[PDB]
Curated annotation (Swiss-Prot):
GO terms for molecular function: heme binding; manganese peroxidase activity; metal ion binding; reactive-black-5:hydrogen-peroxide oxidoreductase activity. PROSITE patterns: PEROXIDASE_1, PEROXIDASE_2, PEROXIDASE_4. It comes from Pleurotus eryngii (Boletus of the steppes). GO terms for cellular component: extracellular region. Disulfide bonds join 3-15, 14-278, 34-114, 242-307. This is Versatile peroxidase VPL2. It is an enzyme of class 1 (oxidoreductase). It is found in: Secreted. Belongs to the peroxidase family. Ligninase subfamily. It comes from the Eukaryota. Keywords: Calcium, Disulfide bond, Glycoprotein, Heme, Hydrogen peroxide, Iron, Lignin degradation, Manganese, Metal-binding, Organic radical, Oxidoreductase, Peroxidase, Secreted, Signal, Zymogen.
Length: 329
């Protein structure tokens, strides 16, 4: 099919996404930047979608977190999420797609702004939300590895799939884990979708970037970086550690598996055959910036190797003394 301006798309229905793309790129993402609203929109895809259980209910990727915001945003596990919900609401009202579609579309468009990013498949036509998600379906950073894997598995994800989705933490920061240090990133490159998250979580924890003993927080290897207890434990767990390590300096695998697993997540509670493939609307992301490296001042001996079958790859360190990671704007 051909849109009004001559551009090809696989299905004529997708043409309506282009004005939405332009609007959100200019007015939500600060001119197609990989900034705070991109990170929060990506986070929102998960907090909407994971509200899905065969036993316990929930409509999955259905826009419920917007359509029933006063209910869902008050769940403890959704702390901090109301900013992005409130920011996206006007766009949904202004345009002609469902809240469920918009959440996934904004997430995909956002990721495409980030150097190293990947194009996530996007499908159009999610019905409006029918009911609020049940509470207690979103994993928390203080939940045990087994609890997290159980919940993600309940929603449909194998343990290796959870590792692949956690590539998102490569472009991520925390405001509520340690409120004394808002906007503290999970890796040294929160503006680049890269393997640094998987490297740096493997390093032995040395310190606290803010205060000690926050719930859901582990020791970080670097000033200016925060480590979730969940990520700490997943990098070291037999079920996930070898997959975790395999992401290190493997940009193609990170991209391939993130795109496929995000697509799966985006379709929780949905039937792909009842939707329209509009993947070709997502822009080409910028190329990777930077190479895979240990932080300056670190060596292989600082890695806590957790994959028995395969040794950690022989990365080199950035030159110079240990340095701190800048907070994110
Ligand atoms: C598997 C269990 C997971 C846990 C326990 C977890 C936990 C967290 C926590 C505690 C934060 C910081 C929130 C704050 O204090 O501000 C965070 C941020 C974030 N999460 Fe995860 N998460 C998980 C999986 C995921 C998944 C599957 C995605 C997929 C998109 C995701 C995307 C993000 C992003 C993009 C941020 C950064 C938000 C920002 O910088 O504004 N997370 N996560
Ligand atoms: Ca939902
Ligand atoms: Ca990164």
């Amino acid at each position: 099919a051909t849109c009004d301006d001559g551009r090809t798309t696989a299905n004529a229905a997708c043409c309506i996404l282009f004005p939405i793309l332009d609007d959100i790129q200019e007015n939500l993402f600060d001119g197609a930047q990989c900034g705070e609203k991109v990170r929060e929109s990506l986070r929102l895809t998960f907090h909407d979608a994971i509200g899905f259980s065969p036993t316990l209910g929930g409509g999955g990727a259905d826009g419920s977190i917007i359509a029933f915001d006063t209910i869902e945003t008050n769940f403890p596990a959704n702390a901090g999420i109301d900013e992005i919900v409130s920011a996206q609401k006007p766009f949904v009202a202004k345009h002609n797609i469902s809240a469920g579609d918009f959440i996934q579309f904004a997430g995909a468009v956002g990721v495409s702004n980030c150097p190293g990013g990947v194009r996530i498949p996007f499908f159009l036509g999610r019905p409006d939300a029918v009911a609020a998600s049940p509470d207690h379906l979103v994993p928390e950073p203080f939940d045990s590895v087994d609890s997290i894997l159980a919940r993600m598995g309940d929603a449909g994800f194998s343990p290796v799939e959870v590792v692949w989705l956690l590539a998102s933490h490569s472009i991520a920061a925390a405001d509520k884990v340690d409120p004394s240090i808002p906007g503290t990133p999970f890796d040294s490159t929160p503006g680049v979708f890269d393997s640094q998250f998987f490297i740096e979580t493997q390093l032995k924890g040395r310190l606290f970037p803010g205060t000690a003993d926050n719930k859901g927080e582990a020791q970080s290897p670097l000033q200016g970086e925060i480590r979730l207890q969940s990520d700490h434990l997943l990098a070291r767990d037999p079920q996930t550690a070898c997959e975790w390590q395999s992401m290190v300096n493997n940009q193609p695998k990170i991209q391939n598996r993130f795109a496929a697993t995000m697509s799966k997540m985006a379709l929780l509670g949905q039937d792909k055959t009842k939707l329209i493939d509009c993947s070709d609307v997502i822009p080409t992301p910028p190329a990777l910036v930077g190479a895979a490296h240990l932080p300056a001042g670190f060596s292989l001996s600082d890695v806590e190797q957790a994959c028995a079958a395969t040794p950690f790859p022989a990365l080199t360190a950035d030159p110079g003394p240990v340095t701190s990671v800048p907070p994110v704007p």
